[PDB]
Amino acid sequence: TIKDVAKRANVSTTTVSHVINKTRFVAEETRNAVWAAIKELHYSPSAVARSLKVNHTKSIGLLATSSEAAYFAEIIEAVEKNCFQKGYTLILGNAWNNLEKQRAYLSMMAQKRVDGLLVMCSEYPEPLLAMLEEYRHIPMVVMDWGEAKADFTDAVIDNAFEGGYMAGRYLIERGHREIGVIPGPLEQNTGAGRLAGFMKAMEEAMIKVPESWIVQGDFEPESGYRAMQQILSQPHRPTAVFCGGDIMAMGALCAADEMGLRVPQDVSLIGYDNVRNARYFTPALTTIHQPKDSLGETAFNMLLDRIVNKREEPQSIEVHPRLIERRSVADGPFRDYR
Amino acid sequence: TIKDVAKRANVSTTTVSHVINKTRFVAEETRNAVWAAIKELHYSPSAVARSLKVNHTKSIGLLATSSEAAYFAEIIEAVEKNCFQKGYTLILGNAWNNLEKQRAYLSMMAQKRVDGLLVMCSEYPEPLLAMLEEYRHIPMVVMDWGEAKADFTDAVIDNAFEGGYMAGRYLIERGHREIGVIPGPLEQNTGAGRLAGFMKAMEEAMIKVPESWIVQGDFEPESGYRAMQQILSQPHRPTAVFCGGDIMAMGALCAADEMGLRVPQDVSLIGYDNVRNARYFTPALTTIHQPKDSLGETAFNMLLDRIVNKREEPQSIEVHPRLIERRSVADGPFRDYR
DNA sequence: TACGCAAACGTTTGCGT
DNA sequence: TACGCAAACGTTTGCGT
Ligand SMILES: Nc1nc2[nH]cnc2c(=O)[nH]1
Ligand SMILES: Nc1nc2[nH]cnc2c(=O)[nH]1
């Protein structure tokens, strides 16, 4: 305890502190002396004590959805550096889209008194929106929203509609007119948003799409498997499918193999995410890339700012995606005709 | 503040507390009354205050190596549930095998006063071992050690040597006598340990292995790529390779493709990890599976026990791996001869 | 029976001199 | 010049009555 180091140090605690935090000038002797005792006495200042005083834990919370999915894990890993190089402590908590679950992690959140709050709950029902607001006191920012759903938070928008668009365009220019689509859950942004972007181009190109060629996915490889399966299992099949996510595409890739179909010789897959190891998919995945890092870093920053600069007004910064050409896509049967 | 709810509640704080923690009987009126104010006044008890008093933060720290690699992310995700269903708060911090880095996260660790400590630093040099010990006060347990490296911690041993063994045996019985190997870093347990297991069987079967058929990997898909590449790029090539890790195998799978070689028609790949989505590799990955969940859950538990049961003696629980047959492996040219 | 007092936990910090 | 006092932060808890 400080009372213990000051003692061994034959100096006031006020002194022990002033040297611990270089908050005011202290003679060299006194300085050194404190230190020695600090070391021999083996002192570890109590952050909890210091925070009960200074009104800030210096730790930010993460109300995530899950932490194993490649997509998530990369953002999550991104944040942590940011937290660390800026002095913060990361508190991770996955709600699994569970209201109860979130209401709890949110609960312990404020209790432990997180200086700030990063959110990625995926689905945002009225109930959620509700609970979230009752903590509008604690600074926060949702990082996975299509557009600014609330006025009480900060947001980083991905322009995922623009991405869904970019993907379809590619297919078109490639020669395809018979595309399919295994989208991510519609309650989601990266779900509906991407699909909706992809579908503008279609109409923009008078391309229709039979319902039998559009199957819901949940970002789980198993789901990609089942869809791709469902797709090619019907008499008339498309020549190129737009896969809602990379790890789903990764799963759709598998099925086509066991299918006996070649890729991209038989099917053309265009994903979306650009996961750390999508380049090494087999084959190499052509895909849309989301700036996961910046989506992360940008978030942490807005928080700090709102924090340290006692910001009060909400905000929302956009981020942008870009096509990444790999090997899952070939020319369509209309390429030369354009 | 409590002083604020008790006031609005026209009752002593001692009362406000006794109802907040059901620590002693309180009349219904008084009870209800407190509550109302608790709600209208919108009170969030201060955990930091309560902990500065009760001597326990109710939060455990995670001094990980990294959090994006599938292997890690799965354990990490495992822990968090365990933490959550048992009432704890997860603090995540990746040291990136950086001494300085770890010494820091370890530093802030004790400061914030983690009730317990989970470790997975991969490489454990004397320097590390040193620093770690100076916190032997704070309860902990390394979860990625070959054998009990220290007497001041708890350990969960994976029997990764037994796994490396299981893998080689498979190859043998399959018909192979010309195997290769892309192992994970030797400073590691899952590195050296697995390799060393795999190599006993070899000798146990009078199988030698040309150095030109053994290439260091770092668990990174890119590394698997380069090795597999290096391997088949030499005049005489093996008929089956044992891949140190799944995500590396995943990377070796790619190269062979671009190689023009078929798998398992041309090469036979046997990985090790059994990652959440290795089944969906292309082809479906035959591999050794580590009980990631239990490796996680078991760890959290030992910690609690050491914690709540004020345990003092070190411990070490083993966990076991098992072969998972998929599609990356075919009979060798010696199968019928046995 | 049902509750209230004050002291304590481990720090920081405004006055001082 | 260089340092020391005491009060405060937001709770819990042993005596009480
Ligand atoms: N698994 C997963 N992948 C995604 N890609 C974009 N959004 C998501 C998401 O919420 N989950
Ligand atoms: N990436 C990675 N994979 C592993 N598989 C077993 N151990 C490890 C490790 O330390 N890192």
Experimentally, the structure was elucidated by: X-ray
Cβ partners under 8 Å of residue A179, min gap 6 = A168, A171, A202, A207, A209, A213, A238, A239, A240, A241, A242
**By three-state DSSP, how is residue A182 classified?**
strand
Distance from C-alpha of A251 to C-alpha of A225, rounded to nearest angstrom: 5
Minimum Cα–Cα distance from B262: chain A residue: A282
**By three-state DSSP, how is residue A94 classified?**
strand
Residue with tokens 């190089």: A85
CA distances from A314 to A83, A140, A155, A156, B66 (A): 21, 10, 8, 11, 33
Per the DSSP assignment, residues forming a β-bridge with B180 are B241
Q: In what order do the strands lie in the sheet with B154-157?
A: A315-318, A154-157, A140-142, A116-119, A59-64, A89-94, B89-94, B59-64, B116-119, B140-142, B154-157, B315-318
CA nearest to A164, candidates A194, A192, A208: A194
| Pocket test residue of B72, B243, B274 for ligand 2, highest count of atoms within 8 A of CB | B72
Tokens of A179: 């595309």
Annotated domain spans of chain B? 1-57, 58-159+290-321, 160-289+322-338
CA distances from B222 to A103, A204, B229, B302 (A): 41, 39, 11, 36
How many other CB atoms sit within 10 Å of the CB of residue A258? 14
CA nearest to B62, candidates B80, B48, B74: B80
Strand-pair category, B315-318 with B154-157 = parallel
Distance from C-alpha of A165 to C-alpha of A322, rounded to nearest angstrom: 11
- Distance between A338 CA and the closest CA of chain B, angstroms: 31
B81 sits within 7 Å of strand D by its CB: no
Q: What share of chain A is helix, strand, coil (3-state, %, to 5)?
A: 45, 15, 40
CA distances from A201 to A89, A205, A209 (A): 44, 6, 12
Chain A CB contacts of B77 below 8 Å: 66-68, 94
CATH architecture of B160-289+322-338: 3-Layer(aba) Sandwich (3.40)
Which residue places its CA closest to the C1' of nucleotide C13?
A14
- Interatomic CA–C1' length for residue A64 and nucleotide D10, angstroms: 29
Resolution limit, Å = 3.0
Tokens of B143: 């979860």
The ligand with the least distance to the CA atom of B76 is 2
CATH code for the domain defined by A58-159+290-321: 3.40.50.2300
User: Using N-to-C axis directions, what is the helix angle for A13-20 and A28-40, rounded to 10°?
Assistant: 90
> What class has domain B1-57?
mainly alpha
**By three-state DSSP, how is residue B90 classified?**
strand
Query: Could you check whether A1-57 and A160-289+322-338 share the same CATH topology?
Result: no
